[PDB]
Each structure stands twice: as C-alpha cells, then as structure tokens.
Amino acid sequence: IDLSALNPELVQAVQHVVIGPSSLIVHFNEVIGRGHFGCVYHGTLKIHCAVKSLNRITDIGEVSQFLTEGIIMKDFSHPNVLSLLGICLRGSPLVVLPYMKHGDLRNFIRNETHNPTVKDLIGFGLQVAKGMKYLASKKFVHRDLAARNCMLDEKFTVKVADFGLARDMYDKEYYSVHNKTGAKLPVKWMALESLQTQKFTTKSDVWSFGVLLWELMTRGAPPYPDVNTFDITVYLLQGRRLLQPEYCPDPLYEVMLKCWHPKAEMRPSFSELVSRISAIFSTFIG
Ligand SMILES: O=C1c2c(nnn2Cc2ccc3ncccc3c2)CCN1c1ccccc1
C-alpha cells in the first residue's frame, strides 16, 4: 500500500477499510456467485461474509483509485444499502461483503418456495426506494438498478447492491453491446435520454426503479420480452410503457408512469417515491 499516493485526507481511513490477511478465511472450494469481473466465495471474518474475487479482469487499474473507491463505499451506511466490510490483499484484491442469505431480489420473487403477498412486494419496493433515497442524497448514481441487482439478508431486509467495488454484470443476458461505444448496457432498465446519450443521472435511476417496481409486481417477469435490444428506443417512442401487472394497485401503476415521465426533471425524487409508496403500502393487510 502506497500511502503517499492517496489524497492526504483519506490516509486515516485506510486502516478502517483494509482487512488483514490473518482475519479472513475464504473458502475457495465452492463458488457461490459469478460475475464478469470474478467469482464470489463464502468467507469467515466470527462473521459470515461473501468474498468477491476480481482476478477475471486483466487489471484493476490504479491501486490508489481502487482504495479510494473502497474508502468512499465504506462510509455509506444504510439498512437498505449493501455495505462494504472491507478489502483484503493477497494476485488481485478481494472484496469482502456481507453474506446475503436469500440472494438476489429477482430470483427471490421468482422462487416457488416463497409466497410474498402483494403487501410484501410493495414493501420490497419501498425498501429499495429508501436505499436509493440515501444513495441519491450522497450524490451517487447507481446506473444499474434492477431487481437482479438488489439482495435480501436472513431477515428479508432488501439492500441495493451492485455498486462501488461490488459492481459487475451478474446476469449477462440483460446487457447489450452499443454500436459506437463498445459498452454493455442494461437497455431495458434505461431511461430514454440514457439510451440516446449514455449519460446516467439520479433521474435515470428513477426510471430504472419504475421498471424494478414492475418486476416486483410481476414476480420477476422479463420486461419487454418481444423487443430486441436497442430497438427499445423505437418501441418506447411509439408511445408505449410496460403494462399494468394483474395485481399491481392502480396508484402503484401511476407511480411507475411517473418514474417513466419523458421529461427527466419531472420524474419523482426518491424521497417522493418513499412517501407515495409508504402510503400505498399502509392500505394493505397481510
Ligand atoms: O452477486 C450479486 C452481487 C451484487 N452485488 N454484489 N454482489 C456480490 C454478492 C454479495 C453478497 C452475496 N451473498 C451471498 C451470495 C452471493 C453474494 C454475492 C448484486 C446482485 N448479485 C447477484 C446475485 C445472484 C444473481 C444475480 C445477481
């Protein structure tokens, strides 16, 4: 670790993010997750954790920047946002994250084992809105909000994941290669202006959130299955939105349409979404 290379402000914060090799046993025997950048394994820190390797990439880039990203992410603390436990050095560094017993939100709602009520699903969405409210107040744009990118712990607490050092493509099926810029993009979750410009804002996160609400209410159906990749722009511009799911409350569909407002600055803040969804949520029993 090259301490002088860092922003002098961040030097103190390093000891709080770095995990000593002797504090962490990672069980490389079974893969429990797969990303484009690397595999993840059970880890023991006595705390049970998910340890993500990054050795599938050629290079992590600047080590000082890697550390910086880690420091920024560690200071984030909210019950609906996945935390960073730390970084452990060994080849490539290991990302140490909490173990999420019930996996990703999309698979959770698709799972025939669990039977979430409409109230449960709305509540999952509310927790996401709250996670996103915190992230937006930190001026952080997620860029890849989707049900696949949120996770549930042992107490079914929903946490926005897939950001900072945990960022990766964990389900490659839903990402498309752009023509002019070789980037791999979650087009079916993206706002119109993002599809056109490839710029992401909190307001395009709000668009993605609307889609995530639709995923929740369809128990994990794929959005726009009869649309092909980048022809989604054509489809939307025909004057189309995802349809109201069978058990989606009318006011909740209205929230979704608001999230998909053609004017980015007219979409609701995440604070307004927390408010509106909490109200809809309170009307249900069971
Ligand atoms: O794998 C992930 C993921 C995310 N952010 N960090 N990660 C890595 C991660 C974090 C905690 C875990 N806990 C238990 C098992 C695997 C884990 C992976 C986003 C969602 N996700 C995932 C998992 C399964 C399928 C699709 C996406």
Tell which CATH architecture fits domain 100-286: Orthogonal Bundle (1.10)
List Cβ<8 Å contacts ≥24 apart for 279-286. Answer: 279/251, 280/122, 280/249, 280/251, 280/252, 280/255, 281/119, 281/122, 281/123, 281/126, 283/249, 284/117, 284/118, 284/119, 284/122, 285/119, 286/117, 286/119
Residues annotated catalytic, as ranges? 144
> Which residue numbers belong to the known binding site?
32-40, 52
Gyration radius from the chain CA atoms? 19
Domain ranges of the chain: 1-99, 100-286
End-to-end CA distance of the chain: 52
SS3 47: coil
Q: Which residues of 218-243 are buried (b: 16+ CB within 10 A; e: fewer)?
A: bbbeebbeebeeeebeeebeeeebbe
Q: Please list every protein residue whose CB sits less than 6 Å from any atom of ligand 1.
A: 32-33, 40, 50, 52, 97, 99-100, 103-104, 148-149, 151, 161-162, 166, 170-171
H or E stretch covering 26: strand 25-34
In CATH, what number does 1-99 get?
A: 3.30.200.20
Determine the Cα–Cα distance for residues 99 and 132; give it in Å rounded to an integer: 20
Q: Pocket of ligand 1, candidates 97, 151, 157, 163: which has the most ligand atoms within 8 Å of its Cβ, to mutate? A: 151
Q: CA 20, 26, 28, 33: dihedral to nearest 10 degrees? A: -110
Residue with tokens 């952080």: 140
> Which residue numbers belong to the known binding site for ATP?
32-40, 52
Whole-number Å distance, alpha carbon 262 to ligand 1 midpoint, is 32
The answer to whether the CB of 49 falls within 8 A of the CB of 60 is no
* Resolution at which this structure was determined, Å: 2.0
Determine the Cα–Cα distance for residues 28 and 37; give it in Å rounded to an integer: 16
Query: Which residue has the CA at smallest separation from atom 3 of ligand 1?
Result: 162
